[PDB]
């Protein structure tokens, strides 16, 4: 779920970068670090809007590295359990459907799919369709998937979705 927060991060600056552009280097390293980080608490990190401030750098005893605490408003995307969200199919096969919501990769199983949709291996592009064939879900389509499960994976959360609920499908 796309969101905007003000977070805090501490960065260690090697004294090599103690030049006139110290603050520029600080912000650059903050971008390089926080950008793209996925954490359990704050979900994924999409981008960094701005830097709230640069707390006074402390000089660690016995190590010239200077610790800078920096506050910064950055966009995140933390999904949940049980929320319909737009998704983009990226590959269809018999085991289940694959869809994408920004950075998060979601998928759909043969239980989450209603009983109407069936596997059609003879279909050259694998697809989920019922006897009426009213709705056919192929690759790249937009589907409404109620998230069900979530799991941290090497500091990178991945979610599992579902569409068993009414109307959850292509539109």
């Amino acid at each position: 779920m796309f969101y905007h927060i003000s977070l805090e991060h501490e960065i260690l600056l090697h004294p090599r970068y103690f030049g006139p552009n110290l603050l520029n280097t600080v912000k650059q390293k903050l971008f390089t670090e926080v950008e793209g980080t996925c954490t359990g608490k704050y979900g994924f990190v999409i981008a960094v809007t701005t830097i709230d401030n640069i707390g006074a750098g402390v000089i660690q005893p016995g190590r010239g590295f200077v610790l800078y605490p920096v506050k910064y408003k950055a966009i995140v995307f933390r999904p949940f359990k049980g929320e319909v969200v737009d998704a983009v199919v990226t590959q269809v096969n018999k085991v289940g459907l694959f869809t994408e919501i920004g950075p998060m990769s979601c998928f759909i199983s043969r239980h989450s799919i209603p009983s109407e949709m069936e596997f059609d291996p003879n279909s050259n592009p694998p697809c989920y369709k019922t006897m009426d064939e009213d709705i056919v879900i192929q690759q790249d389509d937009e589907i409404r998937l109620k998230i069900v499960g979530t799991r941290v994976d090497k500091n990178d959360i991945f979610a599992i979705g579902s569409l068993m609920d009414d109307y959850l499908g292509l539109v």
Partner: protein, 408 residues
Amino acid sequence: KPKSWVRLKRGIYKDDIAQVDYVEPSQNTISLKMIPRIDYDRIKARMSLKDWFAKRKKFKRPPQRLFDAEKIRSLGGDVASDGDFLIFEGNRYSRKGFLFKSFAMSAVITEGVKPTLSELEKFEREHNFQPGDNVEVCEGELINLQGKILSVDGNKITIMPKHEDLKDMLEFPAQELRKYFKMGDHVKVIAGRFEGDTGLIVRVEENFVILFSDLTMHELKVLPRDLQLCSETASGVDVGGQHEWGELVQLDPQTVGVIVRLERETFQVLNMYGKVVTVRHQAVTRKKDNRFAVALDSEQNNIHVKDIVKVIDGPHSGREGEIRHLFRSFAFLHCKKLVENGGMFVCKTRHLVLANELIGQTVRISQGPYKGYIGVVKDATESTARVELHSTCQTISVDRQRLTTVGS
């Protein structure tokens, strides 16, 4: 008790697991069915048992293998049939292959005995409740109530569950206690078809919970009791410490890889080419890491191990990693932000870019202020050498051009 696992103290069958058949306290003897230990070379050469015992001092014991009558028939040994059992060298063998024999209770071990899973496999109620797990009250007056496992015990767990809007704690035994979990939550399987696995449940059937393993997109149905709730990620600790995470292995002489993922049965070793190939524990053999190795790069600069480099070209683009293993034309990079391949990838070294014979001899100093002195070389560098003087109780550094070895 009949059908119990025991062990032996001494003899040629010591340290062998066995199953009880019958016990005779009056005779002080018990019958144990175990895997036979028979030497085929002995049968081939037709040696006597008494001779084998006479020369037992320098003779190695035979291994454990299932009995085969055809093997002895081929080897020329005599095999006799007595109903279900077969008589060979005064011993009764079962049709399956297990060896039944009688031994004294004193020799047999009946305390501190517990078989291993592999042993049980060759020979071929319980509860799993731990703190911090959600359980339901399937039976009893208070039904359809979910509580946390605050305590744990044996036959009668006597848990103190905390139900919804229920500060007080109840008392339920193991049988009344049941393991149930809500939708869209982490679940781990301690015991099952694929034990030590984690997944998410799309539903919870009355007796067949369904989960999807993170390792692969396949359904996994397990008993709800065998299921457990654990927010902690699957550790995947290797058993027997045969291989460590990020450890070089030599699957083939031409190809060398690093183990990036650890699993109960299979391995996912990353080879130089960068692809992922599955192998087993036994097949893969550990290879030593080149603590000091040389290579080449595009910049034509010296590159060593554990050096931050950038993949400006090649299979990966704009990728940063730390070298962990080195090859003539390949290098293994490491990271912690990379989901793929457990954070370990491989890229070419060239594509990577920057981001004694005199020792122990007796020598005479033939020039300089120490001319005439004699000593023993303890450590000589390519140009200078350390000479311990026999006379002055002191070791000095003398240019090797001022030394002449003294010949006998």
